[PDB]
Amino acid sequence: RLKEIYRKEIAPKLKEELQLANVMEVPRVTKITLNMGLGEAVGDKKIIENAVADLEKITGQKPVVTYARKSIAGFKIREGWPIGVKVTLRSDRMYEFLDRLLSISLPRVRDFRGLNAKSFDGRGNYSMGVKEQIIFPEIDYDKIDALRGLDITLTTTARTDDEGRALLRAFKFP
Amino acid sequence: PRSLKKGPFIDLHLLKKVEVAVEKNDRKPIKTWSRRSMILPHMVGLTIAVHNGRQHVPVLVNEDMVGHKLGEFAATRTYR
Amino acid sequence: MKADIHPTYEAIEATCSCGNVIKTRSTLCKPIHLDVCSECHPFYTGKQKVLDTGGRIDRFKQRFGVFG
Amino acid sequence: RIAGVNIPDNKHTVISLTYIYGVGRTTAQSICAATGVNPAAKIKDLSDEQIDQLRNEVAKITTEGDLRREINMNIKRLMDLGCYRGLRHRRGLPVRGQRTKTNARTRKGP
RNA sequence: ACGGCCAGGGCUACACACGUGCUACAAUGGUCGGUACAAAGGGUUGCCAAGCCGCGAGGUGGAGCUAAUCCCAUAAAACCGAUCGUAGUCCGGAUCGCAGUCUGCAACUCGACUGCGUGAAGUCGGAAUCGCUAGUAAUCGUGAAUCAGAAUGUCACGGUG
RNA sequence: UCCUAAAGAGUAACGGAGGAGUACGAAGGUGCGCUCAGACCGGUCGGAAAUCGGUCGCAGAGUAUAAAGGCAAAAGCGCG
Ligand SMILES: [Mg+2]
Ligand SMILES: [Mg+2]
Ligand SMILES: [Mg+2]
Ligand SMILES: [Mg+2]
């Protein structure tokens, strides 16, 4: 459990590290949203359920299908109304899913670097993209279809992205 | 090509014109019709005017060009 | 958390080739070993090294001596 | 992930290792001779014990993600130098010295 | 100088169309390990053995030799046992990157081979169109002319048929 | 529906501009919950843009339907 590592080690360390005043000013991970983009195969009506099932297993939680709000004629028509699949994970699930990252999903990018440290929002929210859906426990390779565009979007209670870097480097995976 | 038993190659006139010209550092280009000679670590940073076939074209010698011969940097046919 | 919506989320053991046992709560419902973990990846072990850039100078001296 | 990339099943060890994209047929035989894995048995019949040794052997030759990077850098070394070998390479003409008048169709498509 | 001598370059360029030729697209087959039989020819300005070191192309070595004597020189297809199970694949080899050997004063334009990696188009091919009536077509080898080096063409004869 | 129409109504011209001869069994009724458009940063085959996170917003969106007048008790959005 990463919560026990965070409360015991990271929380008291960051206060004196960042010259913070009291205990609770330290940044913490707000939520984790995945948002598997099902933009490809708009007029299919067959891959939405497959993506829902694939994302259900790697998160232990039923996702929600996301509809459109406009119509890009260059992109596709509104006939394929469901385009997206989204999941939200708070502390009970966030710190347990985050164990896959930095422990066993670092062998998941097939990379030279774990994750670039130059990708941050103005307020300190981190985002990352996972290329392949093969990378997870309890997932077959023959039965799985290799069409899964998955993101991992992070939210943090940081005023600016330097606090986000300081929080991330604790459970570091750059 | 050019097995290691007889490893290096450099034409005698080019060698005597470049080794001596290293003493008086680069103030002019070296005009030479020979294209069969390799370039060497002793000839890094010089200016060689290799013969294209109707005129001599300058060559900027770099440290990463030592393996390749001079003629690779001079054209033969245009195809504009 | 809704009752009859989520899958079965139980506790399993993740064992790497080096023997790093990690207690992970997942939907797996069984233990499966892994080939590489965070402690065995070359990048986080410092063994990724570099693409070596280019060594023609080196190569030429290794290839051809050229006395004098 | 299985050995760096996904490996097929129901096939012999040497043929299975050929898909690692950096070990061919002869070097796969040398890896099997060094490790001790019998090619006659399928990868399914193998245990999960010596696959770490197979991964160690794979981690001493090359992996595709860096082999493509370094071969592209080798191409870039010719392409940024002014050599004729790269001069034809950019345009897509034959490089080793094949005839260009006709039948140089593999590097130019239909 | 439309005559000569010397350097490089060029005749092997390259969106394209045509003739000839070799590879394939596989299971009458692909690899691995055993085992059988040829003809014809070239070699004292040459063949260049054995031992020997090299993953291999090869390096040393110097015999015998002026030819039923010695070398080139192991013929391959077939046959015996194993695996592959028809899958763009233990098919296919083009392409490209790295590393070498041999010849040559000299292998970039612009040579032939060897070692590792990559792995494409190609699933029997339109109108049309060609060779062949018997050791014939089909398919598999061997050695030579030109030749410092360089053959899918070409020089010559043989296996199964 | 707006102007001509002159700050109550009304007011003509073969005067200037636009629409209708319908739709909804939920597009109605009630209870409970939620913000819009647009700009920027980040995020794998998408990229100025699809789906996601954050901030700046402070209705410049939306109204089933033409324009006018209104809509944070939202008159807009979802669920029983
Ligand atoms: Mg010859
Ligand atoms: Mg009035
Ligand atoms: Mg009035
Ligand atoms: Mg309404």
XYZ file of C-alpha atoms (C1' of nucleotides) and ligand atoms in Angstrom:
677
model
C 0.000 0.000 0.000
C 1.505 3.292 -1.151
C -0.664 5.222 1.331
C 1.421 3.915 4.236
C 4.626 4.848 2.436
C 3.265 8.311 1.725
C 1.968 9.155 5.204
C 5.091 7.917 7.013
C 7.908 9.061 4.687
C 6.820 11.509 1.982
C 4.523 13.703 4.073
C 6.993 14.706 6.845
C 9.869 14.919 4.357
C 8.197 17.310 1.914
C 7.309 19.817 4.654
C 10.948 20.563 5.477
C 11.997 19.970 1.858
C 9.757 22.697 0.379
C 9.866 25.085 3.386
C 6.150 24.554 4.016
C 4.566 25.975 7.159
C 2.452 23.164 8.667
C 1.723 19.470 8.127
C -1.226 19.567 5.734
C 0.197 22.046 3.168
C 2.081 19.211 1.420
C 0.847 18.327 -2.099
C -1.010 15.061 -2.573
C -2.342 13.109 -5.542
C -5.937 14.215 -6.074
C -7.254 11.602 -8.523
C -6.279 9.384 -11.461
C -8.350 9.418 -14.659
C -7.533 7.059 -17.532
C -9.859 8.103 -20.392
C -9.279 5.362 -22.955
C -9.834 7.133 -26.269
C -12.171 5.128 -28.521
C -12.105 7.662 -31.357
C -11.172 5.056 -33.962
C -14.009 2.949 -35.385
C -16.763 5.482 -34.746
C -19.546 3.758 -36.681
C -18.826 0.270 -35.317
C -21.153 -0.424 -32.353
C -18.924 -3.435 -31.539
C -15.648 -2.098 -30.053
C -17.223 0.030 -27.290
C -18.136 -3.022 -25.215
C -14.713 -4.586 -25.856
C -12.971 -1.421 -24.649
C -15.283 -1.267 -21.616
C -14.422 -4.875 -20.752
C -10.687 -4.304 -21.273
C -10.628 -1.213 -19.059
C -12.822 -2.892 -16.430
C -10.252 -5.608 -15.712
C -7.143 -3.408 -15.397
C -8.939 -1.006 -13.004
C -11.305 -3.225 -11.016
C -14.141 -0.785 -11.685
C -16.785 -0.458 -14.380
C -16.009 2.544 -16.645
C -18.506 4.998 -18.118
C -19.021 5.493 -21.834
C -18.650 9.120 -22.915
C -20.738 10.743 -25.637
C -19.924 13.698 -27.913
C -20.801 17.374 -27.494
C -20.228 18.537 -31.090
C -19.613 17.098 -34.584
C -16.296 17.411 -36.441
C -17.235 16.617 -40.043
C -13.561 15.946 -40.734
C -13.511 13.551 -37.770
C -16.862 11.730 -37.968
C -20.637 12.183 -37.831
C -22.802 12.183 -34.692
C -24.256 8.779 -35.642
C -21.499 7.121 -33.613
C -22.504 9.048 -30.492
C -20.372 7.073 -27.966
C -16.719 8.016 -28.539
C -15.039 7.791 -25.129
C -14.587 5.598 -22.052
C -13.542 7.176 -18.748
C -12.689 6.012 -15.219
C -12.088 7.969 -12.001
C -10.108 6.599 -9.028
C -9.887 8.211 -5.568
C -7.754 7.198 -2.588
C -9.147 3.703 -1.994
C -8.380 2.750 -5.611
C -5.825 5.444 -6.516
C -2.973 4.304 -4.271
C -3.557 0.641 -5.190
C -3.692 1.215 -8.949
C -0.649 3.479 -8.600
C 1.250 0.446 -7.298
C 1.152 -1.011 -10.821
C 2.930 2.140 -11.948
C 6.492 2.478 -10.616
C 6.579 -1.215 -9.544
C 5.441 -3.477 -12.422
C 4.129 -1.082 -15.123
C 7.564 0.493 -15.593
C 8.127 -2.597 -17.829
C 5.071 -1.347 -19.757
C 6.268 1.441 -22.076
C 9.152 -0.448 -23.763
C 11.130 2.739 -23.472
C 14.409 4.623 -23.098
C 12.913 6.881 -20.395
C 10.091 6.142 -17.975
C 8.266 9.443 -18.508
C 9.404 12.900 -19.580
C 9.647 15.435 -16.742
C 8.889 18.394 -19.055
C 5.182 17.472 -19.449
C 3.236 19.374 -16.792
C 0.313 21.766 -16.643
C 0.591 25.331 -15.398
C -0.920 24.327 -12.038
C 0.944 21.015 -11.628
C -1.179 18.270 -13.196
C 0.750 15.424 -14.841
C -0.421 13.424 -17.862
C 0.973 10.358 -19.616
C 0.006 8.019 -22.460
C 0.137 4.216 -22.599
C 0.609 2.868 -26.119
C -0.413 -0.779 -25.658
C -3.174 -2.610 -23.801
C -1.059 -5.787 -23.499
C 0.602 -4.251 -20.398
C -1.490 -5.319 -17.391
C -2.205 -8.343 -15.143
C -4.986 -10.807 -16.096
C -4.976 -9.912 -19.802
C -4.591 -12.445 -22.584
C -2.564 -11.796 -25.727
C -4.532 -14.003 -28.135
C -8.009 -12.930 -26.986
C -7.083 -9.234 -26.718
C -7.364 -6.925 -29.724
C -4.454 -4.501 -30.042
C -6.600 -1.373 -30.560
C -6.598 0.455 -27.205
C -5.531 4.086 -26.864
C -5.117 4.562 -23.112
C -4.004 7.644 -21.184
C -3.087 8.094 -17.527
C -3.970 11.617 -16.375
C -2.914 12.709 -12.891
C -4.302 15.492 -10.699
C -2.350 17.004 -7.801
C -3.053 19.636 -5.140
C -0.094 21.768 -6.245
C 0.020 25.520 -6.773
C 2.710 25.131 -9.457
C 4.409 22.296 -11.315
C 7.641 22.372 -9.266
C 5.640 21.030 -6.326
C 4.339 18.395 -8.735
C 7.883 17.385 -9.657
C 8.863 17.257 -5.978
C 5.884 15.014 -5.213
C 6.423 12.772 -8.246
C 10.148 12.186 -7.640
C 9.301 10.545 -4.302
C 7.399 7.699 -5.986
C 9.688 8.438 -8.920
C 9.161 7.009 -12.380
C 10.735 9.505 -14.824
C 37.680 -3.869 -49.374
C 41.438 -3.251 -49.008
C 42.036 -5.988 -46.450
C 43.767 -5.194 -43.157
C 46.951 -7.044 -44.168
C 47.656 -3.935 -46.273
C 45.627 -1.546 -44.158
C 46.043 2.138 -45.002
C 46.225 3.994 -48.311
C 47.309 7.516 -49.239
C 48.841 8.749 -52.480
C 52.453 9.852 -52.138
C 52.045 13.335 -53.606
C 48.938 14.016 -51.510
C 50.734 12.770 -48.396
C 53.791 14.953 -48.986
C 51.593 17.968 -49.831
C 49.406 17.548 -46.715
C 51.901 16.440 -44.064
C 54.143 19.384 -44.926
C 51.138 21.727 -45.222
C 50.110 20.790 -41.671
C 53.212 22.671 -40.473
C 51.995 25.904 -42.139
C 48.365 25.732 -41.101
C 45.336 25.955 -43.368
C 45.367 29.146 -45.453
C 44.518 27.654 -48.875
C 42.644 24.717 -50.438
C 44.443 21.606 -51.650
C 43.761 21.007 -55.351
C 44.204 17.304 -56.111
C 42.791 15.121 -58.884
C 43.242 11.913 -56.872
C 40.012 10.435 -55.505
C 41.330 6.977 -54.536
C 42.971 8.002 -51.236
C 41.284 7.804 -47.854
C 41.486 10.666 -45.361
C 43.328 10.134 -42.101
C 43.288 11.439 -38.511
C 46.353 13.500 -39.496
C 44.163 15.391 -42.030
C 41.185 16.460 -39.887
C 39.881 19.965 -40.567
C 41.671 20.639 -43.870
C 40.122 21.941 -47.116
C 40.460 19.644 -50.143
C 39.329 20.703 -53.627
C 38.428 17.291 -55.047
C 38.010 17.049 -58.814
C 34.354 16.710 -59.801
C 35.299 15.867 -63.395
C 35.288 19.354 -64.918
C 36.082 21.553 -61.890
C 37.338 21.171 -58.320
C 34.722 21.352 -55.552
C 35.716 22.196 -51.944
C 35.521 19.607 -49.171
C 35.108 20.421 -45.470
C 36.937 17.632 -43.641
C 35.347 16.619 -40.323
C 36.371 14.157 -37.620
C 33.511 11.815 -38.645
C 34.733 11.447 -42.265
C 37.913 9.463 -41.540
C 36.552 6.099 -42.679
C 35.286 7.281 -46.055
C 37.305 8.249 -49.119
C 37.405 11.692 -50.738
C 35.503 10.663 -53.865
C 32.293 10.004 -51.928
C 32.003 13.779 -51.377
C 32.468 14.669 -55.078
C 29.624 14.172 -57.549
C 29.937 12.438 -60.923
C 26.529 13.031 -62.534
C 24.030 15.800 -61.836
C 20.457 14.678 -62.594
C 19.003 18.100 -61.825
C -19.057 1.529 -4.257
C -21.986 -0.190 -5.947
C -22.311 -3.847 -5.003
C -23.054 -5.898 -8.143
C -21.137 -3.655 -10.590
C -17.400 -3.992 -9.988
C -15.468 -7.231 -10.634
C -13.884 -9.355 -7.937
C -10.981 -7.332 -6.472
C -8.786 -9.641 -4.364
C -5.189 -9.837 -3.120
C -2.479 -11.654 -5.094
C 1.325 -11.907 -5.104
C 3.569 -10.485 -7.838
C 6.948 -12.268 -7.898
C 9.677 -11.085 -10.262
C 12.557 -13.114 -11.667
C 14.873 -11.618 -9.038
C 12.386 -12.695 -6.353
C 10.908 -9.295 -5.426
C 7.575 -10.263 -3.859
C 4.996 -7.462 -4.086
C 1.620 -7.713 -2.342
C -0.783 -6.200 -4.897
C -4.577 -6.062 -4.696
C -5.960 -6.584 -8.211
C -8.750 -8.338 -10.128
C -6.382 -11.189 -11.024
C -7.623 -13.588 -8.291
C -4.464 -15.705 -8.825
C -0.697 -15.158 -8.424
C 1.318 -14.721 -11.637
C 5.070 -14.158 -11.682
C 6.686 -11.448 -13.809
C 9.908 -11.422 -15.814
C 11.009 -7.847 -15.001
C 10.061 -5.318 -12.307
C 11.025 -1.772 -11.313
C 14.232 -3.034 -9.647
C 15.291 -5.083 -12.710
C 14.589 -2.697 -15.595
C 17.887 -1.464 -17.128
C 16.822 2.197 -17.075
C 16.111 2.233 -13.325
C 19.077 -0.072 -12.649
C 21.340 2.350 -14.548
C 22.206 -0.204 -17.254
C 20.488 1.497 -20.213
C 23.808 3.112 -21.249
C 23.859 5.221 -24.454
C 23.734 4.649 -28.213
C 27.570 5.092 -28.198
C 27.302 8.049 -30.673
C 30.081 7.542 -33.289
C 33.633 6.184 -33.115
C 35.234 6.385 -36.575
C 38.395 7.853 -35.095
C 38.562 4.985 -32.665
C 37.651 2.516 -35.374
C 40.368 3.776 -37.724
C 43.062 3.540 -35.050
C 41.802 0.073 -34.102
C 41.652 -0.907 -37.781
C 44.759 0.760 -39.245
C 47.845 1.629 -37.219
C 49.673 3.813 -39.749
C 53.076 4.208 -38.110
C 54.545 7.697 -38.309
C 7.527 -8.366 -22.320
C 7.678 -12.128 -22.863
C 11.321 -11.742 -23.934
C 11.288 -8.066 -24.975
C 8.501 -8.635 -27.495
C 5.623 -11.099 -27.669
C 6.741 -14.572 -28.759
C 4.622 -17.126 -30.699
C 3.669 -20.477 -29.179
C 3.341 -24.009 -30.587
C 6.746 -23.583 -32.262
C 10.323 -24.660 -31.648
C 12.662 -22.512 -29.569
C 14.951 -21.411 -32.417
C 12.039 -20.332 -34.617
C 10.372 -18.629 -31.645
C 13.515 -16.611 -30.860
C 13.785 -15.501 -34.505
C 10.900 -13.064 -33.894
C 12.957 -11.163 -31.281
C 14.040 -8.763 -34.073
C 17.794 -8.831 -33.585
C 18.491 -12.571 -33.369
C 18.250 -14.503 -36.626
C 18.609 -18.248 -37.191
C 22.309 -18.873 -36.529
C 22.596 -16.672 -33.432
C 19.418 -18.244 -32.050
C 21.125 -21.633 -32.371
C 24.151 -20.307 -30.468
C 21.933 -18.935 -27.684
C 20.225 -22.320 -27.350
C 23.570 -24.153 -27.372
C 24.948 -21.882 -24.644
C 21.846 -21.986 -22.431
C 20.988 -25.689 -22.847
C 17.369 -25.364 -24.020
C 16.482 -28.105 -26.482
C 15.036 -26.672 -29.740
C 13.143 -29.941 -30.320
C 10.676 -29.047 -27.550
C 8.047 -26.376 -28.060
C 8.176 -23.144 -26.078
C 4.920 -24.268 -24.443
C 6.646 -27.360 -23.025
C 9.474 -25.264 -21.564
C 9.515 -24.279 -17.900
C 9.405 -20.713 -16.594
C 12.856 -21.157 -14.989
C 15.378 -20.856 -17.855
C 13.463 -18.070 -19.620
C 15.376 -15.675 -17.355
C 18.570 -17.072 -18.886
C 17.066 -16.596 -22.351
C 16.275 -12.979 -21.438
C 19.839 -12.506 -20.165
C 21.139 -13.806 -23.497
C 18.792 -11.414 -25.310
C 20.150 -8.593 -23.107
C 23.716 -9.121 -24.434
C 23.200 -8.791 -28.223
C 20.583 -6.084 -28.853
C 16.904 -5.210 -28.494
C 14.866 -3.889 -31.427
C 13.992 -0.580 -29.759
C 17.693 0.339 -29.672
C 18.761 -1.571 -32.794
C 16.473 0.569 -34.939
C 17.684 3.693 -33.125
C 21.360 2.907 -33.722
C 20.947 1.727 -37.319
C 18.999 4.938 -38.012
C 21.869 6.868 -36.424
C 24.320 4.985 -38.654
C 22.224 6.025 -41.659
C 22.146 9.597 -40.310
C 25.957 9.589 -40.123
C 26.100 9.049 -43.876
C 23.160 11.368 -44.529
C 24.699 14.358 -42.712
C 28.250 14.013 -44.127
C 27.943 14.622 -47.893
C 28.848 11.101 -49.001
C 27.482 9.716 -52.261
C 26.249 6.612 -50.419
C 23.820 8.804 -48.473
C 23.232 11.116 -51.433
C 21.571 8.233 -53.258
C 20.001 7.001 -50.001
C 17.938 10.149 -49.433
C 16.602 10.220 -52.991
C 15.828 6.507 -52.707
C 18.118 5.198 -55.426
C 20.077 1.942 -55.015
C 23.025 2.350 -52.662
C 25.412 -0.592 -53.090
C 25.802 0.179 -56.818
C 22.945 -1.611 -58.554
C 21.831 -0.528 -62.020
C 19.361 2.369 -62.045
C 18.318 2.317 -65.716
C 15.687 -0.362 -65.077
C 14.427 -2.696 -62.374
C 15.437 -0.562 -59.367
C 11.818 -0.978 -58.353
C 12.101 -2.186 -54.728
C 13.276 1.257 -53.543
C 10.768 3.192 -55.711
C 7.539 1.179 -55.434
C 5.092 0.459 -58.285
C 45.155 19.139 -85.203
C 39.167 15.845 -86.865
C 46.946 13.876 -85.393
C 49.388 12.542 -80.490
C 51.007 11.852 -74.447
C 49.252 12.276 -69.243
C 45.400 12.892 -65.010
C 40.478 12.462 -63.267
C 35.165 11.542 -64.939
C 32.054 8.879 -68.414
C 30.125 4.319 -71.169
C 27.291 0.497 -64.845
C 22.868 7.941 -64.722
C 16.917 7.255 -64.324
C 9.245 9.263 -63.204
C 9.182 5.634 -67.620
C 7.810 1.369 -71.980
C 10.208 -3.255 -74.644
C 13.326 -8.217 -75.536
C 16.138 -12.128 -73.310
C 17.785 -14.651 -68.787
C 17.878 -16.504 -63.171
C 15.045 -16.737 -58.569
C 10.944 -17.816 -56.300
C 5.619 -17.888 -54.624
C 6.475 -23.907 -51.436
C 4.383 -29.994 -48.197
C 5.807 -34.186 -55.758
C 8.645 -29.428 -50.556
C 12.350 -26.408 -46.294
C 16.311 -27.728 -42.830
C 19.509 -31.262 -39.786
C 22.623 -35.938 -39.598
C 24.194 -40.104 -42.248
C 25.466 -42.676 -47.214
C 25.974 -44.076 -53.834
C 27.372 -43.672 -58.885
C 29.441 -39.816 -63.437
C 31.324 -37.898 -68.194
C 34.462 -34.096 -70.312
C 38.409 -30.711 -69.620
C 43.010 -27.805 -67.338
C 47.722 -27.725 -65.043
C 56.933 -27.076 -65.224
C 56.082 -18.780 -66.386
C 51.175 -23.464 -63.940
C 48.095 -27.048 -60.712
C 49.289 -25.512 -56.019
C 48.170 -31.410 -51.875
C 48.940 -33.179 -46.334
C 49.593 -30.961 -41.530
C 48.158 -26.246 -39.486
C 45.563 -21.788 -37.637
C 40.221 -19.291 -38.632
C 32.392 -19.139 -37.237
C 33.578 -18.821 -42.758
C 35.509 -16.417 -47.410
C 40.611 -17.975 -46.350
C 46.340 -17.437 -44.145
C 50.778 -20.451 -43.693
C 53.087 -24.698 -45.786
C 55.548 -26.847 -49.417
C 54.871 -32.130 -51.322
C 53.996 -34.651 -56.097
C 53.830 -32.942 -61.067
C 54.943 -32.398 -66.699
C 51.087 -36.865 -66.798
C 45.936 -43.762 -66.601
C 51.168 -41.615 -61.940
C 50.154 -35.690 -58.594
C 46.515 -31.797 -58.251
C 42.059 -29.046 -59.816
C 38.176 -32.685 -57.265
C 33.758 -33.014 -52.346
C 29.621 -34.076 -58.369
C 24.238 -32.797 -57.228
C 19.420 -34.680 -57.927
C 17.989 -39.991 -55.597
C 17.969 -43.286 -51.358
C 17.913 -43.795 -45.133
C 16.225 -41.403 -40.002
C 14.297 -36.814 -37.348
C 11.509 -32.242 -37.351
C 8.587 -28.493 -39.896
C 2.061 -29.107 -40.640
C 0.609 -25.255 -45.818
C 1.139 -20.319 -41.797
C 3.284 -14.441 -46.129
C 5.478 -19.522 -43.016
C 12.110 -23.412 -40.365
C 8.903 -20.329 -48.023
C 11.181 -16.231 -50.512
C 15.596 -13.729 -50.862
C 15.677 -8.201 -52.718
C 16.898 -4.042 -49.721
C 19.803 -1.743 -46.017
C 23.567 -1.295 -41.245
C 28.098 -3.255 -39.099
C 32.682 -6.546 -39.709
C 36.310 -8.960 -43.069
C 39.237 -11.961 -46.960
C 41.290 -12.314 -51.969
C 43.132 -9.749 -56.655
C 45.045 -5.299 -58.156
C 49.937 1.027 -57.526
C 44.686 1.611 -56.871
C 37.561 -1.811 -54.912
C 33.701 5.985 -53.433
C 31.460 6.869 -58.392
C 32.519 1.254 -59.875
C 34.204 -5.512 -58.501
C 33.485 -10.781 -56.577
C 32.784 -13.415 -52.183
C 32.528 -14.498 -46.512
C 30.380 -13.444 -40.930
C 25.926 -11.070 -37.856
C 21.178 -8.338 -37.997
C 16.833 -6.484 -41.038
C 13.356 -8.604 -43.540
C 10.115 -6.492 -48.644
C 7.165 -7.468 -53.445
C 5.646 -12.396 -54.423
C -0.319 -17.134 -52.769
C 1.066 -19.510 -60.175
C 0.261 -14.455 -62.882
C -5.071 -10.259 -68.365
C -5.454 -9.524 -74.003
C -2.115 -12.256 -76.013
C 2.346 -15.373 -76.872
C 6.455 -18.799 -77.336
C 10.050 -24.006 -77.310
C 9.548 -29.083 -77.851
C 7.750 -35.494 -81.293
C 12.615 -39.242 -77.478
C 17.687 -39.857 -73.918
C 13.169 -35.218 -76.644
C 10.784 -31.543 -72.984
C 11.465 -31.066 -67.597
C 14.962 -30.622 -63.648
C 20.276 -31.273 -60.968
C 25.334 -30.877 -61.227
C 30.388 -30.706 -63.025
C 34.636 -28.348 -65.583
C 36.447 -24.236 -69.527
C 36.978 -20.248 -73.135
C 37.695 -14.401 -72.349
C 40.508 -13.669 -67.587
C 45.262 -9.750 -62.246
C 39.777 -10.015 -60.171
C 34.969 -10.330 -61.907
C 28.732 -14.573 -65.002
C 22.142 -15.635 -63.888
C 24.838 -14.796 -70.277
C 27.993 -17.874 -72.892
C 32.076 -22.623 -73.500
C 31.335 -28.469 -72.900
C 29.953 -33.022 -70.980
C 27.058 -35.917 -67.882
C 22.834 -37.915 -63.686
C 16.883 -39.004 -63.125
C 13.600 -38.695 -67.253
C -41.041 38.811 -35.791
C -38.144 43.875 -36.521
C -38.096 48.786 -38.910
C -40.723 52.788 -41.384
C -44.105 53.982 -36.341
C -42.762 60.243 -34.455
C -40.094 57.070 -26.122
C -48.949 54.555 -24.245
C -52.241 51.557 -28.465
C -52.820 52.168 -33.682
C -51.143 53.700 -38.304
C -50.345 53.154 -45.296
C -47.232 52.289 -49.917
C -46.293 47.059 -56.108
C -41.772 50.247 -48.760
C -36.970 47.747 -46.743
C -35.505 42.354 -44.269
C -36.955 37.122 -42.803
C -40.422 32.519 -41.566
C -44.987 29.296 -40.825
C -49.794 25.608 -43.290
C -45.270 21.561 -38.005
C -43.053 18.467 -34.326
C -43.004 15.795 -28.869
C -46.477 9.582 -25.197
C -41.497 12.400 -23.968
C -39.318 17.313 -26.063
C -45.681 17.168 -20.691
C -46.307 17.051 -14.732
C -43.680 16.478 -10.012
C -39.123 15.480 -6.437
C -33.809 15.590 -6.218
C -28.924 16.983 -8.230
C -25.199 20.010 -12.315
C -23.089 23.983 -15.218
C -22.507 27.284 -20.633
C -19.518 29.290 -24.902
C -14.476 30.482 -25.613
C -8.549 30.838 -24.387
C -4.115 28.261 -22.543
C -0.704 23.812 -20.567
C -0.188 18.614 -20.534
C -1.552 13.858 -22.470
C 0.667 7.225 -27.479
C -1.031 5.785 -34.008
C -5.807 11.606 -33.877
C -3.780 16.891 -33.463
C -5.578 23.745 -35.150
C -8.923 20.375 -33.524
C -12.357 13.879 -31.119
C -12.122 11.482 -25.579
C -9.321 13.117 -20.392
C -7.068 16.497 -16.180
C -6.224 21.597 -14.584
C -6.678 26.780 -14.581
C -8.803 31.746 -16.734
C -14.196 32.137 -16.936
C -17.966 35.581 -14.653
C -23.655 33.148 -20.456
C -19.920 36.401 -25.598
C -23.531 29.130 -25.284
C -28.421 26.811 -25.373
C -33.897 27.358 -26.492
C -37.401 21.582 -31.466
C -38.562 25.198 -34.866
C -37.629 32.270 -38.815
C -36.538 37.067 -36.095
C -37.993 40.077 -31.378
C -38.368 40.000 -26.260
C -36.720 37.100 -21.760
C -34.273 32.917 -19.026
C -28.802 31.778 -11.448
C -36.646 30.813 -8.577
C -32.012 29.388 -14.805
C -37.308 28.768 -18.772
C -30.665 24.976 -20.090
C -28.850 19.607 -18.541
C -29.545 14.413 -16.005
C -31.941 10.631 -12.867
C -36.789 8.051 -10.056
Mg 38.185 -15.442 -64.866
Mg -45.553 53.175 -30.491
Mg -45.935 58.639 -30.746
Mg -37.490 23.241 -22.248
